[PDB]
Amino acid sequence: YTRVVWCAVGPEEQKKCQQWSQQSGQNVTCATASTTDDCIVLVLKGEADALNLDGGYIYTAGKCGLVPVLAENRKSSKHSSLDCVLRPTEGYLAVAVVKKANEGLTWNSLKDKKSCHTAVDRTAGWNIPMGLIVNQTGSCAFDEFFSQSCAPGADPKSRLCALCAGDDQGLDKCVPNSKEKYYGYTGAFRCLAEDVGDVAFVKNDTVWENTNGESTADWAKNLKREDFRLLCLDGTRKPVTEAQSCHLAVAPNHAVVSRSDRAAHVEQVLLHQQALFGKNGKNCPDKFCLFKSETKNLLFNDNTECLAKLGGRPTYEEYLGTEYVTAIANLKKCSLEACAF
Ligand SMILES: *[C@@H]1O[C@H](CO)[C@@H](O[C@@H]2O[C@H](CO)[C@@H](O[C@H]3O[C@H](CO)[C@@H](O)[C@H](O)[C@@H]3O)[C@H](O)[C@H]2NC(C)=O)[C@H](O)[C@H]1NC(C)=O
Ligand SMILES: *[C@@H]1O[C@H](CO)[C@@H](O[C@@H]2O[C@H](CO)[C@@H](O)[C@H](O)[C@H]2NC(C)=O)[C@H](O)[C@H]1NC(C)=O
Ligand SMILES: *[C@@H]1O[C@H](CO)[C@@H](O)[C@H](O)[C@H]1NC(C)=O
Ligand SMILES: OC[C@H]1O[C@@H](O)[C@@H](O)[C@@H](O)[C@@H]1O
Protein backbone atom coordinates (compact mmCIF):
# COMPACT_ATOMS: atom_id res chain seq x y z
CA TYR A 1 0.00 0.00 0.00
CA THR A 2 3.17 2.25 0.68
CA ARG A 3 1.90 5.96 0.79
CA VAL A 4 1.11 7.56 4.14
CA VAL A 5 -1.26 10.60 4.37
CA TRP A 6 -0.17 12.78 7.45
CA CYS A 7 -2.62 15.15 9.28
CA ALA A 8 -1.26 18.54 10.03
CA VAL A 9 -2.87 20.63 12.72
CA GLY A 10 -3.35 24.23 11.56
CA PRO A 11 -1.44 26.12 8.87
CA GLU A 12 2.18 26.23 10.23
CA GLU A 13 2.24 22.44 10.48
CA GLN A 14 0.67 22.20 7.05
CA LYS A 15 3.57 24.30 5.71
CA LYS A 16 6.09 21.93 7.31
CA CYS A 17 4.08 18.94 6.08
CA GLN A 18 4.13 20.19 2.39
CA GLN A 19 7.90 20.34 2.53
CA TRP A 20 8.26 16.84 3.89
CA SER A 21 5.80 15.84 1.18
CA GLN A 22 8.04 17.43 -1.60
CA GLN A 23 11.38 15.88 -0.35
CA SER A 24 9.86 12.48 0.13
CA GLY A 25 8.65 12.27 -3.52
CA GLN A 26 5.01 12.10 -2.46
CA ASN A 27 5.61 9.06 -0.19
CA VAL A 28 3.95 11.27 2.41
CA THR A 29 1.11 13.51 1.60
CA CYS A 30 -0.77 16.03 3.83
CA ALA A 31 -4.27 16.67 5.16
CA THR A 32 -5.09 19.73 7.36
CA ALA A 33 -7.59 20.34 10.20
CA SER A 34 -7.90 23.22 12.60
CA THR A 35 -7.71 20.94 15.55
CA THR A 36 -6.17 17.72 16.87
CA ASP A 37 -9.75 16.34 17.23
CA ASP A 38 -10.63 17.07 13.57
CA CYS A 39 -7.40 15.31 12.68
CA ILE A 40 -8.43 12.24 14.72
CA VAL A 41 -11.79 12.14 12.88
CA LEU A 42 -10.02 12.49 9.48
CA VAL A 43 -8.07 9.37 10.63
CA LEU A 44 -11.20 7.35 11.56
CA LYS A 45 -12.91 8.23 8.27
CA GLY A 46 -9.91 6.98 6.36
CA GLU A 47 -8.82 10.30 4.82
CA ALA A 48 -5.55 10.61 6.71
CA ASP A 49 -3.36 7.75 8.04
CA ALA A 50 -1.41 9.07 11.09
CA LEU A 51 -0.54 12.00 13.47
CA ASN A 52 1.83 12.36 16.56
CA LEU A 53 -0.23 12.99 19.72
CA ASP A 54 0.23 13.80 23.34
CA GLY A 55 -0.86 11.34 25.98
CA GLY A 56 -4.08 13.24 26.64
CA TYR A 57 -5.24 13.04 23.06
CA ILE A 58 -4.10 9.33 22.67
CA TYR A 59 -6.78 8.61 25.25
CA THR A 60 -9.38 10.32 22.95
CA ALA A 61 -7.96 8.57 19.90
CA GLY A 62 -7.98 5.11 21.68
CA LYS A 63 -11.62 4.98 22.71
CA CYS A 64 -12.29 5.54 19.08
CA GLY A 65 -10.20 2.42 18.22
CA LEU A 66 -6.95 4.12 17.15
CA VAL A 67 -3.52 2.74 18.16
CA PRO A 68 -0.02 3.91 18.99
CA VAL A 69 2.51 2.83 16.47
CA LEU A 70 5.82 4.65 17.22
CA ALA A 71 6.81 6.85 20.32
CA GLU A 72 9.03 9.94 20.40
CA ASN A 73 12.32 9.22 22.26
CA ARG A 74 14.66 11.91 23.47
CA LYS A 75 18.45 11.73 24.22
CA SER A 76 18.64 9.83 27.50
CA SER A 77 21.61 9.48 29.94
CA LYS A 78 21.02 5.87 31.09
CA HIS A 79 20.32 3.21 28.36
CA SER A 80 23.16 4.37 26.13
CA SER A 81 24.36 1.15 24.47
CA LEU A 82 20.99 0.46 22.77
CA ASP A 83 20.10 2.23 19.52
CA CYS A 84 17.37 4.91 19.76
CA VAL A 85 14.73 2.93 17.73
CA LEU A 86 14.70 -0.03 20.15
CA ARG A 87 15.56 1.88 23.34
CA PRO A 88 12.66 2.23 25.78
CA THR A 89 11.02 5.66 26.12
CA GLU A 90 11.59 7.42 29.44
CA GLY A 91 8.64 9.73 29.72
CA TYR A 92 8.70 13.44 30.35
CA LEU A 93 8.07 15.38 33.60
CA ALA A 94 5.02 17.56 33.97
CA VAL A 95 6.09 20.64 36.11
CA ALA A 96 4.39 23.90 37.22
CA VAL A 97 6.67 26.91 36.64
CA VAL A 98 6.49 30.40 38.25
CA LYS A 99 8.59 33.55 38.04
CA LYS A 100 11.10 33.69 40.92
CA ALA A 101 10.35 37.40 41.48
CA ASN A 102 6.86 36.18 42.37
CA GLU A 103 7.88 35.30 45.96
CA GLY A 104 5.30 33.59 48.06
CA LEU A 105 3.37 31.83 45.23
CA THR A 106 3.26 28.05 46.03
CA TRP A 107 1.12 25.02 45.11
CA ASN A 108 -1.06 26.01 48.12
CA SER A 109 -1.88 29.53 46.91
CA LEU A 110 -2.62 29.05 43.16
CA LYS A 111 -6.31 29.86 43.71
CA ASP A 112 -7.35 33.10 41.92
CA LYS A 113 -3.93 33.40 40.29
CA LYS A 114 -3.52 33.53 36.49
CA SER A 115 -2.75 30.36 34.54
CA CYS A 116 -1.05 29.40 31.28
CA HIS A 117 -2.03 25.92 29.91
CA THR A 118 -0.65 24.16 26.82
CA ALA A 119 -4.19 23.20 25.72
CA VAL A 120 -7.39 21.54 27.06
CA ASP A 121 -6.98 17.77 27.16
CA ARG A 122 -3.21 17.62 27.03
CA THR A 123 -1.09 15.82 29.70
CA ALA A 124 1.06 18.40 31.47
CA GLY A 125 -0.92 21.36 30.30
CA TRP A 126 -4.35 20.19 31.44
CA ASN A 127 -5.15 16.65 32.64
CA ILE A 128 -2.37 16.36 35.32
CA PRO A 129 -2.76 19.86 36.87
CA MET A 130 -6.60 20.11 36.64
CA GLY A 131 -6.80 16.51 37.78
CA LEU A 132 -4.95 17.31 41.03
CA ILE A 133 -6.96 20.60 41.65
CA VAL A 134 -10.27 18.79 41.29
CA ASN A 135 -9.20 16.10 43.84
CA GLN A 136 -7.70 18.51 46.40
CA THR A 137 -10.51 20.99 45.91
CA GLY A 138 -13.22 18.23 45.99
CA SER A 139 -15.04 19.91 43.05
CA CYS A 140 -15.61 19.66 39.27
CA ALA A 141 -15.65 23.36 39.48
CA PHE A 142 -12.14 23.46 37.83
CA ASP A 143 -13.50 26.38 35.61
CA GLU A 144 -13.64 28.81 38.58
CA PHE A 145 -10.37 27.95 40.30
CA PHE A 146 -8.10 30.27 38.30
CA SER A 147 -9.24 33.92 38.01
CA GLN A 148 -8.10 33.82 34.38
CA SER A 149 -6.16 31.54 32.14
CA CYS A 150 -5.23 30.84 28.57
CA ALA A 151 -6.28 27.24 27.99
CA PRO A 152 -6.56 26.72 24.23
CA GLY A 153 -9.66 24.73 23.28
CA ALA A 154 -11.92 25.99 26.02
CA ASP A 155 -14.87 28.35 25.37
CA PRO A 156 -13.45 31.61 23.88
CA LYS A 157 -15.96 33.72 25.98
CA SER A 158 -14.98 32.17 29.36
CA ARG A 159 -12.19 32.99 31.75
CA LEU A 160 -10.28 29.89 30.62
CA CYS A 161 -9.55 31.92 27.35
CA ALA A 162 -9.19 35.47 28.90
CA LEU A 163 -5.43 35.35 28.54
CA CYS A 164 -4.99 33.88 25.00
CA ALA A 165 -3.99 36.34 22.28
CA GLY A 166 -4.93 34.80 18.99
CA ASP A 167 -2.70 35.20 15.99
CA ASP A 168 -0.91 38.11 14.12
CA GLN A 169 -4.12 40.06 13.80
CA GLY A 170 -6.18 38.84 16.79
CA LEU A 171 -8.20 36.23 14.97
CA ASP A 172 -8.48 32.63 16.25
CA LYS A 173 -8.35 33.45 20.03
CA CYS A 174 -7.84 30.24 22.00
CA VAL A 175 -7.87 27.84 19.00
CA PRO A 176 -5.93 24.69 19.93
CA ASN A 177 -3.16 24.94 17.36
CA SER A 178 -0.02 26.93 16.90
CA LYS A 179 -1.81 29.88 15.47
CA GLU A 180 -2.74 30.96 18.98
CA LYS A 181 0.23 32.87 20.39
CA TYR A 182 0.23 30.96 23.72
CA TYR A 183 -0.70 27.46 22.44
CA GLY A 184 1.39 24.44 23.36
CA TYR A 185 4.53 23.91 25.42
CA THR A 186 6.22 26.97 23.96
CA GLY A 187 3.03 29.04 24.02
CA ALA A 188 2.38 28.39 27.75
CA PHE A 189 5.91 29.07 28.69
CA ARG A 190 5.87 32.44 26.77
CA CYS A 191 2.53 33.20 28.45
CA LEU A 192 4.50 33.18 31.74
CA ALA A 193 7.81 34.66 30.47
CA GLU A 194 5.85 37.72 29.29
CA ASP A 195 4.01 37.72 32.69
CA VAL A 196 0.58 37.29 31.09
CA GLY A 197 0.00 34.48 33.56
CA ASP A 198 1.34 33.56 37.02
CA VAL A 199 1.98 29.87 36.43
CA ALA A 200 2.49 27.71 33.39
CA PHE A 201 1.80 23.96 33.20
CA VAL A 202 4.44 22.61 30.76
CA LYS A 203 7.07 19.90 30.96
CA ASN A 204 10.60 20.02 32.40
CA ASP A 205 12.34 20.18 28.98
CA THR A 206 10.52 23.36 28.07
CA VAL A 207 12.19 25.48 30.77
CA TRP A 208 15.66 24.37 29.55
CA GLU A 209 14.98 24.65 25.81
CA ASN A 210 13.84 28.27 26.01
CA THR A 211 16.25 29.83 28.51
CA ASN A 212 19.96 30.92 28.49
CA GLY A 213 20.37 31.49 24.79
CA GLU A 214 18.97 28.06 23.84
CA SER A 215 16.18 29.72 21.83
CA THR A 216 17.26 33.03 20.13
CA ALA A 217 13.51 33.75 19.75
CA ASP A 218 12.85 37.33 20.64
CA TRP A 219 10.68 36.59 23.80
CA ALA A 220 13.15 34.09 25.20
CA LYS A 221 16.47 35.63 23.98
CA ASN A 222 17.07 37.01 27.51
CA LEU A 223 15.32 34.45 29.68
CA LYS A 224 17.58 33.18 32.48
CA ARG A 225 16.70 29.82 34.21
CA GLU A 226 17.76 31.22 37.61
CA ASP A 227 14.63 33.44 37.17
CA PHE A 228 12.26 30.48 37.39
CA ARG A 229 11.06 28.16 40.12
CA LEU A 230 9.25 24.82 40.01
CA LEU A 231 6.21 24.48 42.36
CA CYS A 232 6.15 21.10 44.11
CA LEU A 233 3.24 19.33 45.74
CA ASP A 234 4.67 19.66 49.28
CA GLY A 235 4.12 23.42 49.33
CA THR A 236 7.76 24.00 48.50
CA ARG A 237 9.56 25.88 45.53
CA LYS A 238 12.82 24.74 43.92
CA PRO A 239 15.34 25.63 41.21
CA VAL A 240 14.48 24.35 37.68
CA THR A 241 17.54 22.10 38.23
CA GLU A 242 15.50 20.01 40.69
CA ALA A 243 12.67 18.83 38.36
CA GLN A 244 13.54 15.26 39.34
CA SER A 245 12.26 15.87 42.93
CA CYS A 246 9.69 18.66 42.31
CA HIS A 247 7.25 17.46 39.50
CA LEU A 248 3.47 16.92 39.26
CA ALA A 249 3.77 13.62 37.30
CA VAL A 250 5.78 11.72 34.73
CA ALA A 251 3.91 11.70 31.45
CA PRO A 252 3.97 9.13 28.73
CA ASN A 253 5.84 10.34 25.60
CA HIS A 254 3.95 11.68 22.63
CA ALA A 255 3.30 8.94 20.05
CA VAL A 256 2.21 8.48 16.41
CA VAL A 257 -1.35 6.90 16.16
CA SER A 258 -3.24 5.33 13.15
CA ARG A 259 -6.24 3.13 12.55
CA SER A 260 -5.30 -0.43 13.53
CA ASP A 261 -5.88 -1.77 10.01
CA ARG A 262 -3.09 0.72 8.86
CA ALA A 263 -0.40 0.62 11.67
CA ALA A 264 1.94 -1.82 10.00
CA HIS A 265 1.96 0.24 6.85
CA VAL A 266 2.24 3.65 8.74
CA GLU A 267 5.21 2.11 10.67
CA GLN A 268 7.21 0.76 7.69
CA VAL A 269 6.99 4.23 5.95
CA LEU A 270 7.99 6.12 9.18
CA LEU A 271 11.13 4.08 10.02
CA HIS A 272 12.33 4.65 6.35
CA GLN A 273 11.39 8.39 6.41
CA GLN A 274 13.37 8.97 9.64
CA ALA A 275 16.37 7.04 8.20
CA LEU A 276 16.46 9.83 5.56
CA PHE A 277 15.16 12.83 7.53
CA GLY A 278 15.66 11.77 11.10
CA LYS A 279 18.45 13.01 13.35
CA ASN A 280 21.24 11.33 11.35
CA GLY A 281 19.33 10.95 8.14
CA LYS A 282 21.04 10.82 4.83
CA ASN A 283 19.20 14.01 3.91
CA CYS A 284 18.71 15.68 7.23
CA PRO A 285 20.85 18.68 7.71
CA ASP A 286 21.57 19.30 3.90
CA LYS A 287 18.03 18.86 2.50
CA PHE A 288 15.16 18.58 5.13
CA CYS A 289 14.89 17.56 8.82
CA LEU A 290 11.67 16.05 10.37
CA PHE A 291 12.55 16.86 14.00
CA LYS A 292 13.42 20.53 13.57
CA SER A 293 11.35 23.71 13.22
CA GLU A 294 13.17 26.56 15.07
CA THR A 295 11.72 25.99 18.67
CA LYS A 296 8.07 25.59 17.44
CA ASN A 297 7.43 21.83 17.87
CA LEU A 298 5.60 21.28 14.54
CA LEU A 299 4.58 17.73 13.78
CA PHE A 300 7.07 16.45 16.44
CA ASN A 301 8.77 18.02 19.50
CA ASP A 302 12.03 19.61 18.39
CA ASN A 303 14.05 17.49 20.87
CA THR A 304 13.12 14.14 19.29
CA GLU A 305 16.15 12.01 18.75
CA CYS A 306 14.13 9.28 16.98
CA LEU A 307 10.69 7.66 16.72
CA ALA A 308 10.98 4.32 18.74
CA LYS A 309 9.30 0.93 18.32
CA LEU A 310 7.02 0.19 21.22
CA GLY A 311 7.58 -3.52 21.90
CA GLY A 312 4.99 -5.51 23.83
CA ARG A 313 2.77 -4.37 21.02
CA PRO A 314 0.83 -2.28 23.54
CA THR A 315 -2.86 -1.23 23.53
CA TYR A 316 -3.57 2.46 24.17
CA GLU A 317 -4.21 1.87 27.93
CA GLU A 318 -1.05 -0.15 28.26
CA TYR A 319 0.88 2.53 26.37
CA LEU A 320 -0.54 5.35 28.59
CA GLY A 321 -0.38 3.24 31.81
CA THR A 322 -3.12 2.60 34.46
CA GLU A 323 -1.97 5.48 36.70
CA TYR A 324 -2.68 7.98 33.92
CA VAL A 325 -5.74 6.16 32.50
CA THR A 326 -7.33 6.45 35.94
CA ALA A 327 -6.66 10.24 36.34
CA ILE A 328 -8.13 11.03 32.87
CA ALA A 329 -11.17 8.72 33.81
CA ASN A 330 -11.78 10.55 37.11
CA LEU A 331 -11.29 14.11 35.66
CA LYS A 332 -13.61 13.32 32.69
CA LYS A 333 -16.24 12.27 35.33
CA CYS A 334 -16.68 16.12 35.77
CA SER A 335 -17.31 17.45 32.22
CA LEU A 336 -20.38 6.35 29.96
CA GLU A 337 -17.90 4.27 27.79
CA ALA A 338 -17.92 5.63 24.13
CA CYS A 339 -15.93 7.35 21.39
CA ALA A 340 -16.56 11.13 21.58
CA PHE A 341 -17.31 11.02 17.79
C1 LIG B 1 -7.46 12.21 41.85
O1 LIG B 1 -8.10 11.39 42.81
C2 LIG B 1 -8.53 10.12 42.35
C3 LIG B 1 -9.35 9.44 43.45
O2 LIG B 1 -8.46 8.77 44.35
C4 LIG B 1 -7.30 9.29 41.94
O3 LIG B 1 -7.73 8.04 41.37
C5 LIG B 1 -7.30 6.81 42.07
O4 LIG B 1 -5.93 6.50 41.80
C6 LIG B 1 -5.32 5.48 42.55
C7 LIG B 1 -3.94 5.33 41.94
O5 LIG B 1 -4.16 5.04 40.55
C8 LIG B 1 -6.08 4.19 42.32
O6 LIG B 1 -5.52 3.15 43.13
C9 LIG B 1 -5.17 2.02 42.26
O7 LIG B 1 -3.97 1.27 42.57
C10 LIG B 1 -3.96 -0.18 42.61
C11 LIG B 1 -2.57 -0.77 42.28
O8 LIG B 1 -2.20 -0.41 40.96
C12 LIG B 1 -5.10 -0.81 41.78
O9 LIG B 1 -5.02 -2.23 41.73
C13 LIG B 1 -6.41 -0.26 42.38
O10 LIG B 1 -7.57 -0.93 41.92
C14 LIG B 1 -6.47 1.21 42.01
O11 LIG B 1 -6.87 1.39 40.64
C15 LIG B 1 -7.60 4.35 42.48
O12 LIG B 1 -8.32 3.35 41.81
C16 LIG B 1 -8.19 5.57 41.80
N1 LIG B 1 -9.53 5.56 42.40
C17 LIG B 1 -10.72 5.58 41.74
C18 LIG B 1 -11.99 5.47 42.58
O13 LIG B 1 -10.84 5.72 40.51
C19 LIG B 1 -6.47 10.10 40.93
O14 LIG B 1 -5.28 9.41 40.67
C20 LIG B 1 -6.18 11.56 41.29
N2 LIG B 1 -5.77 12.28 40.10
C21 LIG B 1 -4.52 12.71 39.96
C22 LIG B 1 -4.03 13.48 38.76
O15 LIG B 1 -3.73 12.47 40.85
C1 LIG C 1 14.99 18.59 32.00
O1 LIG C 1 15.18 18.83 30.61
C2 LIG C 1 16.46 19.14 30.07
C3 LIG C 1 16.38 19.45 28.57
O2 LIG C 1 15.58 18.52 27.87
C4 LIG C 1 17.38 17.98 30.37
O3 LIG C 1 18.71 18.40 30.20
C5 LIG C 1 19.35 17.77 29.09
O4 LIG C 1 19.95 16.59 29.59
C6 LIG C 1 20.54 15.80 28.55
C7 LIG C 1 20.72 14.36 29.06
O5 LIG C 1 20.96 14.42 30.46
C8 LIG C 1 21.83 16.54 28.09
O6 LIG C 1 22.63 15.89 27.08
C9 LIG C 1 21.46 17.96 27.60
O7 LIG C 1 22.67 18.70 27.49
C10 LIG C 1 20.38 18.71 28.43
N1 LIG C 1 19.77 19.76 27.60
C11 LIG C 1 19.98 21.05 27.88
C12 LIG C 1 19.60 22.09 26.85
O8 LIG C 1 20.47 21.43 28.96
C13 LIG C 1 17.20 17.62 31.83
O9 LIG C 1 17.90 16.43 32.02
C14 LIG C 1 15.79 17.37 32.29
N2 LIG C 1 15.90 17.19 33.69
C15 LIG C 1 15.40 16.07 34.20
C16 LIG C 1 15.31 15.87 35.71
O10 LIG C 1 15.03 15.17 33.44
C1 LIG D 1 9.51 6.62 -1.89
O1 LIG D 1 9.11 5.28 -1.59
C2 LIG D 1 9.82 4.23 -2.22
C3 LIG D 1 9.15 2.93 -1.79
O2 LIG D 1 9.51 2.60 -0.46
C4 LIG D 1 11.29 4.35 -1.82
O3 LIG D 1 12.08 3.34 -2.41
C5 LIG D 1 11.80 5.74 -2.20
O4 LIG D 1 13.12 5.94 -1.76
C6 LIG D 1 10.98 6.78 -1.47
N1 LIG D 1 11.53 8.12 -1.68
C7 LIG D 1 11.91 8.92 -0.66
C8 LIG D 1 12.85 10.04 -1.04
O5 LIG D 1 11.51 8.78 0.52
O1 LIG E 1 3.35 7.51 34.19
C1 LIG E 1 3.35 6.88 32.93
C2 LIG E 1 4.74 6.98 32.29
O2 LIG E 1 5.69 6.64 33.25
C3 LIG E 1 7.00 6.87 32.80
O3 LIG E 1 7.88 6.73 33.90
C4 LIG E 1 7.34 5.82 31.76
O4 LIG E 1 7.29 4.57 32.40
C5 LIG E 1 6.32 5.86 30.63
O5 LIG E 1 6.37 4.66 29.86
C6 LIG E 1 4.88 6.02 31.11
O6 LIG E 1 4.19 6.52 29.99
Ligand SMILES: [Fe+3]
Ligand atom coordinates in the same frame (compact mmCIF):
# COMPACT_ATOMS: atom_id res chain seq x y z
FE1 LIG F 1 2.57 16.60 26.20
Ligand SMILES: [Zn+2]
Ligand atom coordinates in the same frame (compact mmCIF):
# COMPACT_ATOMS: atom_id res chain seq x y z
ZN1 LIG G 1 7.51 11.21 40.50
Ligand SMILES: [Zn+2]
Ligand atom coordinates in the same frame (compact mmCIF):
# COMPACT_ATOMS: atom_id res chain seq x y z
ZN1 LIG H 1 -0.49 -5.99 26.03
